[PDB]
Each structure stands twice: as C-alpha cells, then as structure tokens.
C-alpha cells in the first residue's frame, strides 16, 4: 500500500515572468493591468462633458461667432477640445494669460452667464452698432464676438466713459475685455477720434492702463491691427471699473463661476455618448478595479495608475506541470 | 526550485486533483484516490490572498490628472513639467514591473515550500512504518485501510498502533 | 529516556508586524522606524530663535506697517514664522511687485543690518516730509504710514525735481524698497505733488525704470481710490542706485544689508514659541528623533526624518512569538 | 513558515529560554535546563543588526523643506509644485511601507531557517545514537551527562565514543 | 546561509573544480577527480543571466539631459527645478542600491539552494547503498567504478542493481 | 575503505566583494559591475560632428556678435555647445537680454544654422545714419566698435523720420531675429541721438507684437556707459513677415539666423579639452564608452548614456560565496 504527496495541475496556459526565468506557466494568476476601455466620452456623477468641437476655450469664452452652439452651455463634468479646435480669437492679437485662464477653468464645474453691461442701456454716449469686422464673419457678413462689444465714436466724438459693475452674485465673476490697436493714426481717429486715448481697468486687486500701440503689422485674417484680450476674476462684493477715451472692447456678457473639483480640459476626437463612468481618458472610459492601466496618462475621475507596461500578471497558483 | 519539491523530487503535478493545491494520492486494497489537503491549501490561499490585497493596497488610485499648456516663452517650465511627468511615470512603471517579478518568484517558491513541508510532515508521522521512494511516495509496512489513510492526511496517524506489525513485515 | 530538544525563544511581547502573507504577526522583538511624537512648540535651531511675525506678514515687516512695530529691532533668526493671523502687510492698497520672489530671497537670509539709507530729517530739503500719512495706515487712533518708507509731498506750492543716490558700501547685498503712488484724480495729483505730469526714475547697474503715474479712480480699498505699487531690488556691493522724481515717489527711508545663510525658511504656524532647542522643527512642533521617518508634517526646518503618510512602520527583528 | 521549523514541526517557543533566540532544552539523570546557542543567536543578531542599519542608511535625511508662495496668476506652477510634492510623497510612502513588509517576511523566514539548520546540525551529529521524536527532540540511546550534552551544544559530540553503548540499547 | 549547505554542512569550496559551479569529487580503484554537474550548473547560469538582464532591462537609458538656467527673479522655479532633480536622483540612487542588495542576497541563497538540492538528489538515488559522512560525502557499500560513478553524476544510478552487494557489506 | 563521491561547489582566486542585506563585503567567485566610473577626460564628437567651443564668449556674445567673438562668425553646425569658466564676452553694451534663458533653451534643440544678412547695412537705411553707432564699451583691436550682427542707427542731420522695414521669411525654416532698444540716461542724449523725445520701437509679425519705449533714467556707468541697451529676439516662422517701425532707439537687425532643428543637443559648461574622438555619450568631465546601466560621473549628459546615481559601487553577485580555504 502507498501514499503519495503531490500538487495540483490544470490546463492553464497563463504565464508570468519571474526574475530567474520568463514565461512560466502557472495554474492560477491575476492580471493587474487594465488595457481596455469603451472608446466613448461619458458622464461623471451623471453630468455630461462640454464639447467645444471646432472651438477652443478662447472662442467659447469670447463667443467667437463660429461657436454659437456653446452659448447655452452652463454645466459640465469636464471640457473637451478636439483636433479641429481652431476657432478662438478671430481678430488677431494676444490673449493675455490664456494658459492661466485655462488652468482656472479646470476647477470650474458650472457658471451662470449674465449681461454684465447691457448693450442697449450701458453706453448712451458711444456707438454700439458698428463694431464688426470681416475677420469675424458670420453668414457672409462682418460680425464680432457675442460676449464683447466693440465701442466706437458717436458722430465725431468719443467722450470719456466710466462704467462700474458691483459683484452681487455671491461667487467669483469672470470678466473679459479687449483693447484694440489700429495699424495707423488715421484709423485710430476714424474709430475713436482721440489720438491720445487710454483704457483703465481697476478693481480692488486689478489695476492696469493700456494705450494704443499703432503700427503696421503683417495682416492676419485681413487685419494689420491687433486686439489684445484680458480677463480677471472679480471676487464677491468687489467692483470693477472701466474708464476709456478709445480702444475699449467692452465686456458685454460675463460668467459667475461655480468651483468644483476633479474636473479638467482634455483633448480627444472620441464621440460623446449617454453612458456613465467613474474614470475617463481621452481614448475612452474605463470600468475597472485593477490597480494599473496602460491606456492613457490623462484621466478624469477615479482611475487606475498609468504605467508604460504591456503585461503585469501576478502568479497566485503554482508552476503548472501536467505532463 | 528553491525547495526542491515542485519540478524536483516530485517531478510532476496532478491534473487529477482538482479540489486543492496540495494533497495526497493513496492506493490500498479498498481502492485508490486523490484527496486535496484542506489545511495546507487554505493557508496558502489566505497567504496569497493577503499578498495580492497588499500589493493592490499600496497603489493609490489616480485622481484627475490632465495636461497643462505653456506659451512659446515658457519652454523651460514646459520642459520641467514634462521632466516631472516622465520621471514619475518611469518610476511607477519600474516599481510596478519589479514588484510583480520579485513577488512572482516568491510565490512560486512559497508553493514549493508548502509541498516540501507537507512531505516532511507525513514522513515524520510515519517514520519507519513506511519507506521513502524518492518521488513523494511512501510504501507502508502494513495494511492501511481508508480509515488509516484518512488518519495520515489529517495528522492523527497512530504510529505505536502499527509499529509492531510494521516492524515484523519490515 | 534521555533527551535534548532544539527550540526558540518566546516572551511576553505584544509587538505586531505586517508581512506580505499575513497581517498583525506578534514577534519577540521589533523596532519602530516611524516618529510620531513632537513637543508642540516652536524652538530654537543652533541656539537661535525664530522671528515671530505675529499679526504681520513679510510685506508688513519689510515695509514697516505701523502695526508691526515690535519687529523694528529684529536682526537675526533661525527661521521666520507667520501665523493664521498674519494680516498686516500693505495697508495702502496696491501691488507689491515680485512679492513671492522677495519671500523666497528672504528664505536664505539668516540676518540683516537695518540702516537709514536716506535719513528723513536731512535727505529731502526741498520737499515736504511730514504730511505723508493716510487713514488707510492708521495706528493708535491717528493717520500714519510705513516706518521704512517716506511719502514725500510738495513744499508749499512746489515739488522740484529730486535726484538722490546711494552707493552700497556695506560689503554685502542691500535690499532697497520703495513705492510709486498713483492718485485717483488730477486734483489729488496736484494737491500732493503740484506737477500734473510727473515721473519717478530708478536706476542702478541692473535696475532701470521710469514710472509714470496712472491717474484713475479705482474702487475704494481701506478708504482709498488711489493705489501704491511697491518695488524692491538687491543692490550689489559697490553698486549705486539713483532715484529721480517730479512727484509720486514713496522714498526708501530704511534699507537692509543682508547676510546669506542656508537651511532657513518661512513656515506658517500657530504653535507657541518656547526657549527650547531642536535640530528639527515642524509647524506642529519640534522633533527629537534618530528614526528615519516621521508622519508629523511634510514641512521641516533643520535635519529631520523623511515625511511619509504611514501610520505604522515596524520592522521585525526577532521571531514569531509563540508562548 | 518557509523552512518548516517555527510554528511547524517545533510547535512553539520557550519562555524559559531567556538568553538567546535559539537553543536547547535537555533532561538527563543530573537534571533539566535551557541553554541558548551562542553561535546561532549571535550570527542572527549580526545579520539583523546589519539589515536594520542598511535600511536606515539608504534613507538619507530630509533637510529644510518648506512651502512656496505663488500669486493668483501662477496657478500652473503652483499646481506643478503640488504635483511634485505629492508625487515624491507617494513614492517615499510606498517605498517605506513596501520595504518593511518585504523585509519583515524575510526576517521571519531567516529565523525559521536558523532553527531548521540548528536542528539539522544536531541531527547529523547524533546520527543513530539518538531517535528523532519529531517535535524538535532527540532521545539518546546512551547516557549523556552534562559534559556530553555540552559537546552536543558546541558541535564537538564524539559519535564513536558512544556508538557501542547505543547499538546495544538500540 | 539559508539552505545550510555552502559554508554549512559542506564546509568549503573547491578550487580544483574549474569547469562549473557545482559538481562532484570521486575516488575509486581507478582514480580520483572532479567533475562539474552540467545540468545544475547550466540551470543556474541561465537563471542568473536572466536576473542580470532583467535588472538592466528595467533601466531605460538616459538621453540628453542638460541644465536649465534661471534669471535672478526666477528663484522659486529654479528651486523647484532643483527639488525635482534632487528628488529623482535620491529615488534612483535608492532603487539601484537597494535592488542590488536584495538581489545579491537572493543570488547567494539560490546557489546555496542549488547545492543542497544536488546533495539531496544524490542522497535519494543512493539510499542505503552508501553511507552519508556528513560533509557532502558518500561512501559506497559496493564497488563503484567510472561507469557507475558517471551513472550517479547523470542521475541514472541503478540502486537495485547494487543493493545485494551493498547489503552484504553494510551488515 | 570504500569508493566515495562528494558533492561540492566552485572556489577560485577571485577577490571581488559584494554587499548583501545581512552581510557586507562578501567575497564571491564571480560578479558584474553595473556602475560606470570611467571617462576619457575629453570633449568628443557626437555622430562624428564636433562641438562648438564658445571659448571666451558666451551664447549672447556669439549670437549678437560681440567683436571679441569673431572666431565664431564662421560656426554653422555642431553636436552640442560648450561654454567654459572664462565665457565672459557677451553683452559688451550694458543692459538686459530679455528672455535670454528661454533663448538658451531653444538653442538646445538647434544643430546648425545659416547666417544671412537680413537687412543689409549699406542699402536698408537710406534716411538714417548707419556709421556712427560704435562705443568704447564694445572696443576691438584698439578702436570703438559694436556687435557684428546688429546696427545702431542714429539720426541723419537733425531728423529721425519714422522707419518701417519688413523682412519676409523665405528660408523654409525658422529664422532667429535679434534686435536691441537703446535707453539713454537723459532726455538730452535722447534728443542728440534720435531727435524725437517721444520715440518708440514697434516689432510685429503674425504672432509677435511688442512696443518698446525708451526708459530714460539717471543711472551709473557700466563699462563706461550710463546708457543701457536691451536685447530682444523672436523666432519668425516660415512664410511669416516681421516689421520694425521706429522713431528712435532701434538697434536694428543686421544679420539673422535660419535655424535647423535637431534633437539631443544642448549646452554644457566644461573646461575639458576638445579632441578628435567620437562618442555616444558626453559629460562635462569627459566622454563615456560603456554598456553599463548606471554612472556616477556626471548628472549632465549628451547622447545616449547610463543613468546618473550618487552610488560609489554597484556590483551584483553572479557566482557564489568564495571559500577556497
Ligand atoms: C474658424 O476656424 C476656421 C479653421 O481655422 C477658419 O477657416 C480658415 O480661415 C483661414 C483664414 O482666412 C483660411 O486661411 C486663409 O486661406 C486663404 C486661402 O486658403 C486656401 O486653402 C483653403 C483650404 O484648403 C481653400 O478653401 C482656399 O480656397 C485656398 O485655396 C489664404 O489666402 C490666406 O493666406 C493669406 O493670409 C494669411 C494671414 O491670415 C497670411 O499669413 C498669408 O501669407 C496670406 O496673405 C489664409 O491662409 C483657411 O483656409 C480657413 N480654413 C478652413 C478649413 O475653412 C475660420 O475662418 C474660423 N472662423 C472664425 C470666425 O474664427
Ligand atoms: C491690521 O490687520 C487687521 C486685521 O486684518 C486690520 O483690521 C481690519 O481692518 C479692516 C478695515 O478695512 C476691517 O474690515 C472692514 O470692516 C468695516 C466695518 O464692518 C467694513 O465696512 C469694511 O468694508 C468697507 O470697505 C471695503 C474696502 O476696504 C469694501 O470692500 C466694503 O464694501 C466696505 O465699503 C471692511 O471690510 C476689519 O474689520 C478689521 N479687523 C480688525 C480685527 O480690526 C487692520 O486695519 C490692519 N491695520 C493696518 C495698519 O494694516
Ligand atoms: C571680453 O571679456 C573680458 C574678460 O571679462 C573683458 O575684459 C575685462 O573688462 C572689465 C571691464 O572693463 C575689466 O574690469 C575693470 O577693470 C578696471 C581697471 O583696469 C576697473 O576700473 C573697472 O571698474 C573694472 O574692474 C577687466 O579688468 C577686464 N579683464 C581682462 C581680462 O582684461 C573685456 O572687456 C570683454 N570685451 C568685450 C568687448 O566684451
Ligand atoms: C481547460 O478547461 C476548461 C474547462 O474547465 C475548458 O473550457 C478549456 O477549453 C480548457 N482550456 C485550455 C487552455 O485547454
Ligand atoms: C462595470 O463592471 C462591473 C463588474 O464588471 C459592473 O457591475 C458594472 O455595472 C460596470 N459599470 C459600468 C458603468 O459599465
Ligand atoms: C515582560 O517580561 C519582562 C521580563 O521578565 C518584564 O520585565 C516585563 O515587566 C514584562 N511586561 C509585561 C507587560 O508583562
Ligand atoms: C549516464 O551514465 C551511464 C553509465 O556510465 C551511461 O552509460 C549513460 O549513457 C549516461 N546517460 C546519459 C544521461 O548520458
Ligand atoms: C587567479 O587565476 C588566474 C587564472 O585563472 C591567474 O591568471 C591569476 O594570476 C590568479 N591569481 C592568483 C591569486 O594567483
């Protein structure tokens, strides 16, 4: 009579690497590396992302006339730019501290847009109806940004304007404006009358003064002039005051901001869908409890840690020796 | 390889034994059979389950991480940000892969150790009431019915009881 | 029967450790690697006490906000402490240019010699030196001003051009601070400085600026629609700094000759300062430990154990304990 | 355990043996007692001391490290600074916790091995002059006085000396 | 060591066995000599070669890395850059040193294990046809010429063939 | 007295030692070093291309064309750029080189260029003075001089009319354009040089746009000059145009650089001698020739190098504990 000691074998074809030898077949193992996603852009906390489409952040917040679909946007789980996100500033110029504004937006989960300076009643002594350009066309006609107002001389006079807004919204307000720089002194005169024009913007914390920089530049979208774009975050209770004798592209609409965490701006050409996820990448969503993933380093939500690995399989059972 | 049992002095595994990782094959008059060892297997299961949960537990999930943008006069801080992202990624990739390699070696050696310990356990129960073959098998010097076998498996084998019979046959 | 048994030690230890295969293993001996104790006090390093800013911050200290008078004598410290109430900084509203860089500079200063760079009573014979006070900087019931700067105004109905240089003969870097005032109106400009169109210029071997007042009413802060910007520079040994102005200069009065040292820093803490000594300081308290790790605070001054998020790091030295 | 001695074929430890980690308990006609094994315990103490010191020595101390301040237009670099601090903190917490976990496993197994090897050393000294009980104990076939016992403890047991007596009784 | 053989029950090494890591010394009427065990030696070489290569493979090379410069008003970012460079250097120095320490231990133990398993392999082939001395040696209870020795070395020793001769001499 | 077989292991005369967790300095029969600590003490070619030796010049002195840096006027391609501890010729006229560190960062991915006369001196400026813009601060060979790659324009007669001058980039690659803005110490010197008290300089391309206005302040002499000049640069993309407009104070581009981008280059500081050898890996101390994973020679490297660590030894055991006794 006999008794033997022995160990399990099965038909497992799972392999793992060890330090002394590669590709060892084991009876059981577990994969620690997620390499699968659903190829879509989903909701988080059941909230849909904001798809900018052919627009970028600048085109959205300024209201580039190509971005009118976004006018209604007010809340999102994250923001999506695409490979075709080219509509931003349609009048050439510099968007001052643009990358910083993008970083700010990354912690904004919603806003309420409102008419900070109503076009019809804010500017009785200035022309509000002629500030359009072929650089920002819409429907084959010269136009302009929807959230800013290009003020010009009424008749032959641009009197000193002074306009203030007090922030009674109970939260931060994002105010955007521009300053225009004609290419010639006669153009400065046509638009604004005053050769020695200035723009001054002040709040409790912001304080800047701008003067026209008149010079011929290479034409960009037909324009030898430039417009620089500016922004500030006005704190609850604070006031912002504009004073100008020309060259002000005035705020028309502004944005009362709601801060939230875990949001962000991603770049992706993946389709938006009605599904819901805990973890989103620019390639697609992940539904996994595995500790690692090799899908993408950019993530929104709660995700496995990105690593460059192709295989992370941990042995749990033993060397498989079925002979 | 470390403990000499798996792929060693016990040359091969048993596809016939499906209810556990380690166990016994017995053969007597009353029949032959496979029987997993509940205790050794279960201790191996709790151990490995703990190993896996511990590996996973050390790995913080990743919360929102997205890109930053930089203008054409911020190339130094753009390159710094890139040095930071690439450097952390090199380190985590290294840590993940190395932890899996080393732990896999340890896990296979652990199973080897469990088999070996089970073997020597049985060998200490039986002593001279059986002879060792060299391949994980013992030949008894007495009749060991399924009651006796069972005793050998659950560690209650009574040596003195059969010591005389075995001495005789031996 | 005659016998010998081989065995191992057991004791009454209740020390537990974690291993990969099993948690809370009781072992006969072990060593804790994790420091979790501190004394709850801010202590001296190398026998030198920290500088407690108290209700002031770094700006209030260096400018001499009138609420910061207890710091007027401070000259050396081991590290600098701000508190949750370090609120007194710039009392007249405006921007402190490169303020964070100045804080970083002061982080590697271990002492200084404060000196009267331009004595108030003798430096400014053609200008008014006694009227430069403001309700924005009130102290003890009266309008006042920074102790380390001097607000020059017109003498009678005249503010003639001033020109004033200082040569650095201190044998080390000198920190010089000044301001430029921007009134809210032409009326206040003329009232303070007489000259409607004024400037301030500052030059050294490395610094070069002409400042022009920017006259505009901003929202009132601390009762002021005007603004004052604050500037600073480090003058190298042997270099000269030259100030010229026809108005709007908040002149240096006191400057600081800097001694550089390493291992210093600024921390924020509400823990009390005490006459104790340490080699390692955190914002929660001092640490006296030769252990490799601590979970007390990531901010440390001195020679400290490495900060980790762990609650337990216990290394087995002895064996499994089985009594 | 990996080597099968501690909490293994030697069920438990000795609160009676206070002067070392490993050793012997004997009973002869002269009396009983515990005695630590100097050689084994000491080698283990040197090894463990070295392991602890190596771990500590690889962790170079933290020198002055304080927060940085950033203005309201420096959010990108403020966030970069935070990413760097958190990232290094993740890595060091991971490395500390993991090093202690893995080394703790190794230390326990080192001890287990030291006990196994001590038992095997005695076993090959004694050969068939004693019978193995199986619980870590040997019963001699001859009289083994305090001097004989001491020779077993210090590795200089004279097998031939007692082979004839032992055969007789065996 | 962990497995008790090297510097253990086999007290020292053999400078006379030059063509392998583990092996055999024999003595019989025909003569004396050393011979490496090819199977165990080659298995160890393969393992260790794989270990070294796996270590190197996880160390992707360093491409161009040159210093960044900062002006006198960029002290915070200069210091951030230094914190990053120092932090990564601390980590990589730590990983390289520790990996070498731990793996060196594992490697010596792997050798100790291979010697122990080779010894136990021979022991179980020979059984009671030889007596264990204790120092890694076996004395045959039967004559064992060169062909017989080679059978022990290549793992084909025939215990039953020599059992009767052995039993006569053992008693 | 029977036949015998013993089991045993290799020993040899190796003296190699390794450290382990439990024990230091263990002698082993075989081992491999993973730490490269040897270099050849020289600066070598990479891909068979020599480095550019700035010598007594720095990158500012090279690009602006400090007259002391004339030996560099012919440099056109390099594998990396070498500054030394005596690289002090740069901005001979005192002032600030704006975004200089950014320019240095850009140059780290430039492997060659073609210098060209962007605005030829003799024909570009018919209404301004082109011959009087020299200074003792930039003296060469016993005479007042100036940067070779810029041109200090001043008033002709009693007038400085508005200039406007454009360059279209037809080079098929990025063009690095440098210019300067002079800041006199007094309003009087402003008038004497440029006539217009209210002067400006404007520079614009499709993407770049900046206005510069003299900042006139009394200030000390540096290299004999109370004036300052700020130096500026921009990268003009293929097909784009740059336009300079000024009513004074412009230090005009004269020569500019069409750049070729290439990876894995950079700027190092080293006093080691350049030699005619080739390497895969260069550090400031010397070149490395090694297949090892780690090195402790230098954290700065160019090419494909082992990883820098602070370790003084990294030796892996491969063989066993060596016990010849
Ligand atoms: C929303 O975003 C879109 C996409 O970016 C913009 O559409 C582009 O507008 C630009 C600017 O006008 C167009 O670029 C211009 O193209 C002219 C001809 O382009 C050729 O190729 C296109 C596409 O293949 C053809 O449709 C076209 O018939 C031509 O064959 C050029 O003449 C222009 O060059 C001149 O001006 C530029 C300065 O801007 C100079 O640098 C040049 O040297 C030259 O003098 C110019 O490059 C582009 O074609 C449009 N793309 C598409 C896909 O439509 C929208 O305008 C934008 N809308 C808003 C309001 O933001
Ligand atoms: C030293 O620091 C202390 C503590 O920070 C500081 O005392 C604080 O001063 C301010 C004075 O502005 C006080 O806050 C004010 O409270 C009044 C009364 O309720 C408000 O009306 C004020 O708001 C008006 O003005 C604001 C602009 O400044 C407007 O935004 C607002 O709409 C109103 O018009 C203002 O909030 C605060 O109460 C005290 N606190 C204490 C503890 O005394 C002190 O002034 C500092 N001293 C110096 C010289 O730095
Ligand atoms: C090229 O670089 C060299 C080396 O730096 C420059 O030469 C150095 O020029 C400085 C400034 O003129 C000299 O320092 C000065 O010396 C005089 C006394 O002789 C003193 O009065 C000044 O205050 C200052 O200390 C320095 O001596 C001189 N060194 C050498 C080695 O000659 C040179 O000017 C540079 N040339 C150009 C065109 O960039
Ligand atoms: C192994 O067994 C399963 C069922 O237990 C069977 O479905 C499968 O085909 C087999 N797999 C392999 C790899 O042989
Ligand atoms: C994700 O997978 C789990 C289990 O695989 C499942 O229960 C859950 O419904 C899935 N969730 C989504 C959003 O796909
Ligand atoms: C544990 O044992 C030691 C040694 O006998 C003794 O000093 C100590 O007081 C004991 N502690 C406890 C908690 O029993
Ligand atoms: C092993 O040794 C025997 C006896 O010397 C020999 O005849 C046989 O061919 C060998 N087998 C192998 C593995 O080559
Ligand atoms: C060690 O051996 C090598 C050849 O194997 C020989 O060249 C060298 O001289 C020897 N060294 C000693 C210690 O004699």
Numbering used by the authors:
A (entry chain C): 11 to 54, 54A, 55 to 83, 83A, 84 to 95, 95A, 96 to 125, 125A, ...
B (entry chain D), D (entry chain B): 1 to 170
C (entry chain A): 10 to 54, 54A, 55 to 83, 83A, 84 to 95, 95A, 96 to 125, 125A, ...
E (entry chain F): 1 to 171
F (entry chain E): 9 to 54, 54A, 55 to 83, 83A, 84 to 95, 95A, 96 to 125, 125A, ...
Authors' text:
One notable difference between these two antibodies, however, is that mAb 1F1 not only inhibits the 1918 H1N1 virus, but also 1943 as well as select 1947 and 1977 human H1N1 viruses. This study provides a detailed characterization of one such antibody, 1F1, and highlights common, emerging properties of cross-reactive anti-head antibodies.
We also determined crystal structures of the 1F1 Fab and “avianized” 1918 HA (SC1918 D190E D225G; AV1918) components separately at high resolution (1.45 Å and 1.80 Å resolution, respectively). The overall structure of AV1918 HA is very similar to previously reported structures for SC1918 HA. The two amino-acid substitutions that differentiate Av1918 from SC1918 (D190E and D225G) had no significant effect on the overall architecture of the receptor binding site, aside from the altered side-chain substitutions.
